[PDB]
Design a protein around this ligand. Structure first.
Ligand SMILES: [Ca+2]
Ligand SMILES: [Ca+2]
Ligand SMILES: [Ca+2]
Ligand SMILES: [Ca+2]
Ligand SMILES: [Ca+2]
Ligand SMILES: [Ca+2]
Length: 300
């Protein structure tokens, strides 16, 4: 309430101490849920925060990113307000920053925007984010790689046209290569990304198959890691939701025997996901694939 208008005014303060302070307070208020986010938007914060993405002051920039990321953790309409204030061109340009901290925070903000509805996701694609995000799949910096993977995964949680944009940007070969990663964080994310691409139409599922995902996905059905096991099951289950050619590719890769054995796993969630995937492979229908979105905060 009554202190918020002052905080927003202070985003243009000639006193850098007052500015940085107001920015941090807004960032923190935007951690408090969608009603609190809406109070920040209603006080007029957005134009100023977006303007500050052009700041050459790295402390200001990092906090502005933090604030906008938190606002973009809200509802689809709150995300759309951020897009409407003009955030995307600045965020996309920041994907080329040589500052790893700024890059990380930019990625998180983009990822949150791409956790909105299909129209919000399409704005991200139309702003040109995908070629940069796909290029970052090759980063030797695990932190950067992890945040780019989340952004791609969220973009692939849209409709078939959004998924097709991801495929056409050349993401699949890198994502399939990541299924070999010894890094459990990266592996999990690569599986989210591929699962979401495999939640589209049959020709999207087939692009995943044609890029060579199945043998690695079937190997992961041998993991003692219950989290990785569930993630590989989700991916196989999405692919098995396609048509006959897709179901048949899954059978040719040897999944049947393993899916059947996994119905005897003590973990009830694994049991259930195995049974469901198996029923789809032997079913005559299609559909039932699952999409997942990730939202993250930034509390400084
Ligand atoms: Ca001054
Ligand atoms: Ca500077
Ligand atoms: Ca650097
Ligand atoms: Ca490294
Ligand atoms: Ca490891
Ligand atoms: Ca285990």
């Amino acid at each position: 309430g009554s202190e918020l208008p002052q905080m927003v005014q202070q985003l243009n303060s000639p006193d850098q101490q007052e500015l940085q302070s107001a920015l941090r307070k807004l960032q923190q208020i935007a951690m408090g849920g969608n009603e609190q986010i809406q109070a920040v938007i209603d006080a007029g914060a957005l134009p100023a925060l977006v303007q500050l993405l052009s700041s050459p002051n790295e402390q200001i920039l990092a906090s502005a990113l933090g604030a906008l990321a938190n606002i973009a953790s809200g509802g689809n309409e709150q995300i759309q307000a951020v897009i409407d204030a003009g955030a995307l061109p600045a965020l996309v340009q920041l994907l080329s920053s040589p500052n790893e901290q700024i890059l990380q925070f930019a990625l998180i903000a983009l990822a949150n925007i791409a956790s909105g509805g299909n129209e919000q996701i399409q704005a991200v694609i139309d702003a040109g984010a995908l070629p940069a995000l796909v290029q970052l799949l090759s980063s030797p910096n695990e932190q950067i790689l992890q945040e780019a993977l989340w952004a791609l995964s969220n973009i692939a949680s849209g409709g078939n046209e959004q998924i097709q944009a991801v495929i056409d940007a050349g993401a699949l070969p890198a994502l399939v290569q990541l299924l070999s990663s010894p890094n459990e964080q990266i592996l999990q994310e690569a599986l989210w990304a591929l699962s979401n691409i495999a939640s589209g139409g049959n020709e999207q599922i087939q692009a995943v198959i044609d890029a060579g995902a199945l043998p690695a996905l079937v190997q992961l059905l041998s993991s003692p890691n219950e989290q990785i096991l569930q993630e590989a099951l989700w991916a196989l289950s999405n692919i098995a939701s396609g048509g006959n050619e897709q179901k048949q590719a899954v059978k040719e890769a040897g999944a049947l025997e393993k899916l059947e054995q996994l119905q005897s796993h003590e973990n009830e969630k694994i049991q259930k996901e195995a049974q469901e995937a198996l029923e789809k492979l032997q079913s005559h229908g299609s559909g039932g694939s699952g999409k997942r979105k990730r939202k993250a905060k930034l509390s400084f």
